[PDB]
Design an enzyme around this catalytic site. Sequence first.
Site, PDB file in Angstrom:
ATOM      1  N   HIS A 114       0.803  -1.223   0.000  1.00 53.11           N
ATOM      2  CA  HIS A 114       0.000   0.000   0.000  1.00 53.11           C
ATOM      3  C   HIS A 114       0.835   1.273   0.000  1.00 53.11           C
ATOM      4  CE1 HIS A 114      -3.967   1.959   1.482  1.00 53.11           C
ATOM      5  NE2 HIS A 114      -3.117   2.946   1.264  1.00 53.11           N
TER       6      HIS A 114
ATOM      7  N   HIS B 217       1.173   5.401  -2.099  1.00 53.01           N
ATOM      8  CA  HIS B 217       0.603   6.389  -3.020  1.00 53.01           C
ATOM      9  C   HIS B 217       1.746   7.042  -3.800  1.00 53.01           C
ATOM     10  CE1 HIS B 217      -3.566   6.438  -1.382  1.00 53.01           C
ATOM     11  NE2 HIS B 217      -2.931   5.890  -0.360  1.00 53.01           N
TER      12      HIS B 217
ATOM     13  N   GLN C 224     -10.641   8.661  -4.562  1.00 53.83           N
ATOM     14  CA  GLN C 224     -10.373   9.428  -3.347  1.00 53.83           C
ATOM     15  C   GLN C 224     -11.487  10.314  -2.819  1.00 53.83           C
ATOM     16  OE1 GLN C 224      -6.983  10.468  -1.088  1.00 53.83           O
ATOM     17  NE2 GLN C 224      -9.045  10.353  -0.183  1.00 53.83           N
TER      18      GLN C 224
ATOM     19  N   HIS D  22     -10.123   1.422   0.875  1.00 56.88           N
ATOM     20  CA  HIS D  22      -9.622   2.249   1.999  1.00 56.88           C
ATOM     21  C   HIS D  22     -10.857   2.122   2.909  1.00 56.88           C
ATOM     22  CE1 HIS D  22      -6.314   3.850  -0.344  1.00 56.88           C
ATOM     23  NE2 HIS D  22      -5.963   4.638   0.658  1.00 56.88           N
TER      24      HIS D  22
ATOM     25  N   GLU E 273     -11.110   4.110   7.631  1.00 56.76           N
ATOM     26  CA  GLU E 273      -9.886   4.799   8.087  1.00 56.76           C
ATOM     27  C   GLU E 273     -10.350   6.044   8.834  1.00 56.76           C
ATOM     28  OE1 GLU E 273      -5.620   6.797   6.703  1.00 56.76           O
ATOM     29  OE2 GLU E 273      -7.194   6.525   5.197  1.00 56.76           O
TER      30      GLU E 273
ATOM     31  N   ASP F 202       2.353   3.259   3.047  1.00 58.98           N
ATOM     32  CA  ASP F 202       1.288   4.222   2.753  1.00 58.98           C
ATOM     33  C   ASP F 202       1.760   5.449   1.971  1.00 58.98           C
ATOM     34  OD1 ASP F 202      -1.691   5.214   4.441  1.00 58.98           O
ATOM     35  OD2 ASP F 202      -0.573   6.479   3.060  1.00 58.98           O
TER      36      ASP F 202
HETATM   37 FE   LIG Z   1      -3.836   4.896   1.194  1.00 61.19          FE
HETATM   38 MG   LIG Z   2      -4.236   7.893   2.863  1.00 61.72          MG
END
Ligand SMILES: [Fe+3]
Ligand SMILES: [Mg+2]
Lengths: 423, 423
Positions: free
Chosen positions: A58, A60, A153, A211, A214, A310
């Site tokens: 995981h 980005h 997102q 996701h 979270e 992450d």
């Molecule tokens: Fe993430």
């Molecule tokens: Mg994040």
Amino acid sequence: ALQTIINARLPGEEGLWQIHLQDGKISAIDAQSGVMPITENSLDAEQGLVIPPFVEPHIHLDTTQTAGQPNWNQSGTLFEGIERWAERKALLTHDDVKQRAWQTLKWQIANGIQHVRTHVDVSDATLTALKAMLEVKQEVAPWIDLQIVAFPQEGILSYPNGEALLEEALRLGADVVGAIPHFEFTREYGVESLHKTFALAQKYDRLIDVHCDEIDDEQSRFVETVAALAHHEGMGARVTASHTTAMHSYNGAYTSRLFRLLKMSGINFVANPLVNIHLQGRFDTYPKRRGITRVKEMLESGINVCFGHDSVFDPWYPLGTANMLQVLHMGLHVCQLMGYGQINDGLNLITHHSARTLNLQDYGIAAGNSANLIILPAENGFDALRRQVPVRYSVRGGKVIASTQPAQTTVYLEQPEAIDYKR
Amino acid sequence: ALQTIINARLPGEEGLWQIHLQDGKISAIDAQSGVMPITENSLDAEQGLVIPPFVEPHIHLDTTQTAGQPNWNQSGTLFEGIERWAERKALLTHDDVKQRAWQTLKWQIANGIQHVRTHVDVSDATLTALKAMLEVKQEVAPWIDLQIVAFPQEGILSYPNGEALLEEALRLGADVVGAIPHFEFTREYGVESLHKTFALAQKYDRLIDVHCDEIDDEQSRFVETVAALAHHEGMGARVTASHTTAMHSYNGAYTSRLFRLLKMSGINFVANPLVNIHLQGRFDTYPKRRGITRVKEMLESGINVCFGHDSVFDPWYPLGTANMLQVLHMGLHVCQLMGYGQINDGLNLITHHSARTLNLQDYGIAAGNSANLIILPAENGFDALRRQVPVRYSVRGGKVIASTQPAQTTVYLEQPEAIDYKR
Ligand SMILES: [Fe+3]
Ligand SMILES: [Mg+2]
Ligand SMILES: [Fe+3]
Ligand SMILES: [Mg+2]
């Protein structure tokens, strides 16, 4: 070309082992009764630990390497991070995304990581980062197998054309369908978004990585829908719930009921220690909760859980060198997996368990598999973790793709003495 | 045959009463101005308390009498109980279920219980326990009116063919439709399962008894759906919510709002004190919650609530002699119904309120009703409860079906003295 890896230690095994290589694959693995001599075409592990490659389940890559551009996040908060990223909008181009993603990928290659799953924001009608990442995936293929998650997102139902853009990303080649139910405007949109995510994964035969919950909200229970839908479709192996930090705040009775379903469903879980300890608990004053999902309990229950970095060097997480042993170190402390065996077995959280999360079909030191392996200059998982050792050699397809000459430390006492931090 | 019950005390009434019997029914009830002489065909209550039979509104006869077979539950936990039961699987046969159910039923007959509602697990394609229980129901009919609940223990939507098996159980003759919403994989399956349960009850004209919110989860609110559906269909009298232990953990504002609906709906509630105090609060450390539903508040609001034993001598509850006064004793303590009147009125929780829960049409000491009554060697409900008295005589259809000759205790001081534990 390399024909053998000699004097190798293997996790959970006694003694030393020889790994024979042929045509880019592992042909056989044989035990040694002593130390073997080096020779041409032999890579000497020198009684170090040999394991399949580290995995980053995981990250980005679309936002990596942007911390401080044009300004630094001074409070360290999520809110300010969003604002700092917005100030950099004029620099977000095709070439910029490729350059930054490649910079972090090179750190990953250096760190023995040969498998990476990156989430890419697809709540953008121009799909700029996605188009760039699809090219990066092809370019980095000789060194890293990169999976791309189409990550909506801003939500699927809560963003204009969110569902159409998510599907467009899959039509362009994204490997995994993402979602973010707790960010949708309502609980109902959250649940509905998951039905849409699963329908797309079945329509295109893709993996799923949500996701999931979270947030420090004891009422955020989207994980039960992710697991139930996976069980219904018989596709648990292809499904992952990332974060699930809300689980840290659930009452124990509900968690116990939920765990039966989690095990039955066969889905995977990703915890992101460095970022979770930083961004969770921000609404508490004192005491402050840790905010990492129930890793220890998952391990005790046989539920597959693993660790991701992450973010690396960006507005949401300013630190990092994309090092999995560093991620593991943080996770073991925050999750209180500090007994000797728990620490030693920790390597599974950044190797085998992560490979399962990515549904990898060619992973592990076994005859018939591609010769993808790394060598750590340590005696076992505990030693590697304690000393935060670098990757001495990374081998892919039977060829060395990275190497680190260890640092050399000397103290000048009555006489000079080399220090290796071993007792 | 018996023609009269004389010198009887009745709850809430002053003095002594004579109950005239004819053709298996109560023909008339007349007050006495003094003690009547005994004579042929007269059963002398001896100024003891006469009440309609005790009722067991919630028991699991399919699992009763199995504790320690083949091994004992040493931790006492639910988890270990499930494992111990699994080790006995080879012994679970038609005849085994009948033998064990009959053993507990005999204890119940001895304890003045003439009405029993047993839940039977129907999450079994072979419906082994159900077929056995349907035969037991016919065999025990002369002594106990047994109601069978088709209980989908593993869920309706969360178990293969759960709904089809639940309906099959009704087609075979089960009297009541069960459900267990909090055990379903998701909240949505929980709510949907209740719509299916109510549809089946209306299709077959059966009662409903849901294992409802039996969990220390403040978010488990399936009880509002049970009550709302009952109100919508105008069938509250035929509906029961068993356990509702989650209600012990609800905030007061939601509970107050909910109570208006509970009263309007007319549904029944069963609390199981012996098992609830044992299995609830298991995820707390200290302080530890009691975990019984809001019995005191239900009584104050005129909502029908009663007590069941739940389990007898099995992996989930190792104790018990199927004694309702013992169940009542535990409930009064844990629910803090310890004022004199609260204790004295306690008998209602194991007689009249339970009869209403079972929707009984022939129950109570009233002219025209079947001559089903029991005699307790005590002055009132308080005295019977304090001394945990046995049932002196149980009468059904005007005939004695059980009797207990009281124990005789003597202390040898300067002279022998009989002790009856009265002051
Ligand atoms: Fe993430
Ligand atoms: Mg994040
Ligand atoms: Fe029950
Ligand atoms: Mg039970």
